[PDB]
């Protein structure tokens, strides 16, 4: 059910031990010693990773290492499609702008922060949540020259439970993290977009890196003189596998949750955020799909844009399914009613007053928030020519010195970025006509961005004519129209350009809405501090976890499948046989690697197959995870590595507001499948040899 603070391990230990945990408490998390927590890293600022050897070998997801694999790929050595397997440490590829963060120490600094906050004076100050203010307190507690006296170490204070608890983290950051291994994309991203958020899952979502450091194991930027880090702790790999009901636990960095949403915030999330994103993306994707299906060249140009739009579209459908079917609104309503009844009995009205302030703030901002989501989904991300070039103040104050050519060169660079090899003006006009037709039906004339008033005023409500006129008369409507402008440029031409005016007025409205909506965040945040304080005072902090905030957490549960719908059961484990069932040679998403297909046919599974001779691929668990948990180590009752978390099923996206015991599952790549791929596909025996594999 929860995403627990490391401090909460003491209070959860007896429940974990009854559920199957076998390791000693301090072997998992020791606040003043070495523990398993010391083998967990925040990988590249978003993902989780884990150290799996005494030479700093790190495992994370393939989608986590995707950018590094792509940056080292060329036409001659396409690592993204073929996989990468460094046969010696010297062949491991350095990565620019990478980092791994270890959580060296964690301390409760609540009383210290609350004492410092007493000097504020202004009761409505937001300093209690300010990263700048909390950094000043972190620095004061750690000392003037902390990072100079403790190289590689840094401090950070974060707020938890809406400002009712504060923790100081002592972090050790390494920036020389080299690419060691990766399966082909056919394995690393087998399901590709079709199987995103899907269980059963057959994706070998892993990649391998290595942390390098100076001669003393201290952090150091990339240098050819750097040596592999010898860490104080690494995970042992288990080859014992998993069974239904086995205890499983994860450590990682879940990003965000909204477990303390009021019922009014759940209604707002459904009726505004989700319904608008669903409606607008369905229109956009429908036009894009029609055009991609009709022209093979349009499919090539728009495939990535279509897939990117689909990600949050699918998430919103999953979230709305939970709101409709799992009683999310009703459960938040019962939580707040129970606090209100308890507050009335204790004679303290501040809790009911805080819930009232959140409801009133939500109700007040409804029209503005609807307008913001409509323009953001409908135009800002919906229409490509909304991001067409807008001449800067220095560019207009250059066209009207011979630096007219410099301004034109900068405008041309932005025009070529907008109208690139993947941009179709015809596809964009079709998308804009459908998107604007919906936007104009939903937003009244008086709330429209200034240029969109021309649809009714100048074009007699003809959206197609308004869009045609933008491209026909704009200097960014075609290459020939831009070149005619670039030969005889004038500020008068740019100031009256229909595309520039559209882009300017839609971005003006988008910013004006953002500015009007920003003040509504603070009364909700302040009321949440009081709301969560009451929930904690009423029921305690030993069943009510703090919202995720990109900090180290543990979660535990069992390896267990679930029933998605009447008469259908999805088991706890997928197999290599399931990859072969999904093979479609003429569908790029479901192509199967020839070496992997050969391994399956010859049953060359070695020590990685289960007791029945079947090769495991992935498993699912009742652990509570979210975005940020990608690459998290999944542990046995003994703390041994049994897999890597890589996804969550769509039925569990609602889990960020309310954990769903009968539907929500973490989707995990089995460590036996990771080793089978390293061994039989990569042939990288040295990686297997440096790991500590337990029978």
Smaller CB distance to Cl ion: residue 39 or 248? 39
Minimum distance from residue 485 beta carbon to a copy of itself (Å): 36
Minimum distance from residue 301 beta carbon to a copy of itself (Å): 20
Minimum distance from residue 576 beta carbon to a copy of itself (Å): 9
Given the residues 63, 451, 572, 624, select the one marked as catalytic: 63
Rounded CA gap, 133 and 496, in Å? 46
Minimum distance from residue 325 beta carbon to Cl ion (Å): 9
Applying CB under 5 A, the span of 154-162, 191-199, 230-238, 373-381 interacting with Cl ion comes to 230-238
Neighbours of 325 (CB within 10 A): 12
Rounded CA gap, 586 and 597, in Å? 16
Structural contact between residues 309 and 292, judged by C-beta atoms closer than 8 angstroms: no
Rounded CA gap, 520 and 524, in Å? 7
- Which of ligand 2L1, a copy of itself, Cl ion, none does 449 bind, CB closer than 5 to 8 A by kind? none
* Residue 212 touching ligand 2L1 (CB under 6 A): no
- Which of a copy of itself, Cl ion, ligand 2L1, none does 567 bind, CB closer than 5 to 8 A by kind? a copy of itself
* Residue 680 touching ligand 2L1 (CB under 6 A): no
Rounded CA gap, 173 and 517, in Å? 37
E strand segments, 615-695: 616-621, 633-635, 641-648, 666-670, 693-694
Pseudo-torsion of CA 115, 118, 124, 130, nearest 10°? Answer: -40
Smaller CB distance to ligand 2L1: residue 34 or 587? 587
Of residues 313, 326, 325, the one with CA closest to residue 382 = 313
Neighbours of 571 (CB within 10 A): 14
Contact map string, positions 261 to 300, toward ligand 2L1, x by CB under 6 A: ----------------------------------------
Residue 424 bears catalytic tag: no
Structural contact between residues 369 and 268, judged by C-beta atoms closer than 8 angstroms: yes
- Which of ligand 2L1, Cl ion, a copy of itself, none does 575 bind, CB closer than 5 to 8 A by kind? a copy of itself
Rounded CA gap, 666 and 460, in Å? 53
Pseudo-torsion of CA 235, 236, 239, 240, nearest 10°? Answer: -90
Minimum distance from residue 198 beta carbon to ligand 2L1 (Å): 6
- Which of a copy of itself, Cl ion, ligand 2L1, none does 650 bind, CB closer than 5 to 8 A by kind? ligand 2L1
Q: Which residues contact 257 (CB under 8 A, 6 or more apart)?
A: 3, 547, 548, 626, 656, 657
Smaller CB distance to Cl ion: residue 326 or 429? 326
* Residue 197 touching ligand 2L1 (CB under 6 A): yes
Rounded CA gap, 116 and 113, in Å? 5
Given the residues 207, 238, 388, 630, select the one marked as catalytic: 630
- Which of ligand 2L1, a copy of itself, Cl ion, none does 46 bind, CB closer than 5 to 8 A by kind? none
DSSP structure string for 477-522: SSHHHHHHHHHS--HHHHHT-HHHHHHHHHHHHHHHHHHHHGGGHH
* Residue 392 touching Cl ion (CB under 5 A): no
Applying CB under 6 A, the span of 68-76, 313-321, 360-368, 601-609 interacting with ligand 2L1 comes to 313-321
* Residue 317 touching ligand 2L1 (CB under 6 A): yes
Interacting residues with a copy of itself (CB under 8 A): 200, 202, 290, 293-294, 561, 565-575, 577-578, 581
| Sole residue written with tokens 């408490």 | 25
Longest dimension (CA), the chain: 80
Return the residue of 115, 662, 688, 692 that touches Cl ion, per CB under 5 A.
662
Smaller CB distance to a copy of itself: residue 270 or 572? 572
Given the residues 44, 176, 195, 205, select the one marked as catalytic: 205
Smaller CB distance to ligand 2L1: residue 337 or 581? 581
Return the residue of 660, 667, 681, 684 that touches Cl ion, per CB under 5 A.
660
Smaller CB distance to a copy of itself: residue 494 or 620? 620
DSSP assigned state of 587? S
Neighbours of 550 (CB within 10 A): 15
* Residue 321 touching ligand 2L1 (CB under 6 A): yes
Residue 630 bears catalytic tag: yes
Structural contact between residues 618 and 572, judged by C-beta atoms closer than 8 angstroms: no
Contact map string, positions 334 to 353, toward Cl ion, x by CB under 5 A: --------------x-x---
Omega before residue 109 within 30° of 0, cis: no
Structure tokens at 211: 């942390």
Q: Is 524 helix (H, G, I), strand (E, B) or coil?
A: helix
- Burial of residue 374 (CB within 10 Å: 0-12, 13-18, 19+) is buried
- Which of ligand 2L1, Cl ion, a copy of itself, none does 317 bind, CB closer than 5 to 8 A by kind? ligand 2L1
* Residue 314 touching ligand 2L1 (CB under 6 A): yes
- Which of Cl ion, a copy of itself, ligand 2L1, none does 198 bind, CB closer than 5 to 8 A by kind? ligand 2L1
Of residues 259, 251, 248, 2, the one with CA closest to residue 106 = 251
> Could you tell me whether strands 237-238 and 693-694 are parallel, antiparallel, or unpaired per DSSP bridges?
parallel
* Residue 322 touching Cl ion (CB under 5 A): no
Contact map string, positions 67 to 106, toward Cl ion, x by CB under 5 A: ----------------------------------------
DSSP assigned state of 189? T
Smaller CB distance to a copy of itself: residue 195 or 541? 195
Return the residue of 83, 94, 252, 318 that touches ligand 2L1, per CB under 6 A.
318
Residues noted as catalytic: 63, 205, 630
Residues at the site binding ligand 2L1, with contacts judged by CB under 6 A: 197-198, 314, 317-318, 321, 650
């Amino acid at each position: 059910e929860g995403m627990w603070l490391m401090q909460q391990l003491g209070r959860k230990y007896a429940q974990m031990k009854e559920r199957g945990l076998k390791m000693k408490e301090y072997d998992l998390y020791n606040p003043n010693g070495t523990s398993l927590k010391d083998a967990v890293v925040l990988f590249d600022g978003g993902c989780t990773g884990e150290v799996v050897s005494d030479r700093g070998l790190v495992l994370t997801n393939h989608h986590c290492g995707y950018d590094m694999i792509q940056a080292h790929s060329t036409l001659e050595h396409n690592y993204l499609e073929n996989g990468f397997w460094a046969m010696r440490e010297a062949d491991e590829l350095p990565n620019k702008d990478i980092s791994v963060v270890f959580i060296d120490k964690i301390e409760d600094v609540t009383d210290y922060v609350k004492k410092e906050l007493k000097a504020i004076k202004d009761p409505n100050s937001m300093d209690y949540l300010s990263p700048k203010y909390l950094q000043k307190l972190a620095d004061k507690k750690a000392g003037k020259n902390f990072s100079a006296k403790n190289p590689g170490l840094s401090v950070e204070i974060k707020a938890f439970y809406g400002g009712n608890l504060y923790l100081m983290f002592t972090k050790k950051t390494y920036t020389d993290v080299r690419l060691v291994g990766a399966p082909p994309s056919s394995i690393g991203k087998f399901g590709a977009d079709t199987d995103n958020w899907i269980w059963p899952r057959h994706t070998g979502d892993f990649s391998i890196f290595r942390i390098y450091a100076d001669k003393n194991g201290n952090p150091a930027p990339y240098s050819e003189d750097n040596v592999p880090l010898k860490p104080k702790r690494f995970f042992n790999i288990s080859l014992g596998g998993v069974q239904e009901n086995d205890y499983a636990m994860i450590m990682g960095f879940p990003g965000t949750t909204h477990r303390y949403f009021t019922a009014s915030e759940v209604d707002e999330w459904k009726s505004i955020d989700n319904d608008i994103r669903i409606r607008m993306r369905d229109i956009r994707q429908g036009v894009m799909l029609r055009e991609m299906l009709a022209d093979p060249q349009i499919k090539i140009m728009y495939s990535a844009k279509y897939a990117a739009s689909q990600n949050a579209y699918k998430r919103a459908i999953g979230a709305n399914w939970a709101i409709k079917t799992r009683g999310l609104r009703q459960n938040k309503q019962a939580m707040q009613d129970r606090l209100i009844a308890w507050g009335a009995k204790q004679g303290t009205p501040r809790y009911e007053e805080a819930v009232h302030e959140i409801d009133a703030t939500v109700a007040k901002r409804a029209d503005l928030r609807r307008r913001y989501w409509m323009i953001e989904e409908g135009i800002i991300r919906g229409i490509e020519f909304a991001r067409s070039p807008i001449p800067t103040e220095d560019e207009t104050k250059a066209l009207q010195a011979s630096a007219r050519k410099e301004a034109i060169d900068k405008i041309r660079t932005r025009y070529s970025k907008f109208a690139n090899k993947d941009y179709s003006a015809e596809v964009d006009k079709k998308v804009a006509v459908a998107m604007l037709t919906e936007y104009l039906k939903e937003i009244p004339y008086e709330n429209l961005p200034l240029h969109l008033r021309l649809v009714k005023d100048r074009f007699a409500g003809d959206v197609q004519a308004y869009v045609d006129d933008i491209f026909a008369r704009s200097v960014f409507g075609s290459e020939a129209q831009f070149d005619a402008f670039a030969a005889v440029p004038s500020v008068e031409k740019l100031a009256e350009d229909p595309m520039v005016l559209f882009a300017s007025s839609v971005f003006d409205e988008y910013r004006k809405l953002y500015n009007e909506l920003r003040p509504y965040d603070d009364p909700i945040l302040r009321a949440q501090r009081t709301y969560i304080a009451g929930l904690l005072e009423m029921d305690g902090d030993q069943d009510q976890f703090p919202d995720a905030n990109l900090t180290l957490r543990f979660t535990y549960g069992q390896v267990k499948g679930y029933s998605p719908r009447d008469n259908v059961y999805y088991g706890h484990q997928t197999t290599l046989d399931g990859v072969m069932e999904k093979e479609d040679p003429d569908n790029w998403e479901f192509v199967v690697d020839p070496k992997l297909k050969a391994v399956y046919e010859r049953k060359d599974f070695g020590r990685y197959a289960d007791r029945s001779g079947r090769m495991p691929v992935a498993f699912c668990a009742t652990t509570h995870t979210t975005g940020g948990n990608s690459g998290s180590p999944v542990m046995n009752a003994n703390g041994e590595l049994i897999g890597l978390n890589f996804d969550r099923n769509w039925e569990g996206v609602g889990g960020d507001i309310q954990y769903l015991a009968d539907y929500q599952r973490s989707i995990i790549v089995d460590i036996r499948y990771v080793l089978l791929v390293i061994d039989k596909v990569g042939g990288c025996q040295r990686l297997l040899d440096e790991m500590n594999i337990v029978p």
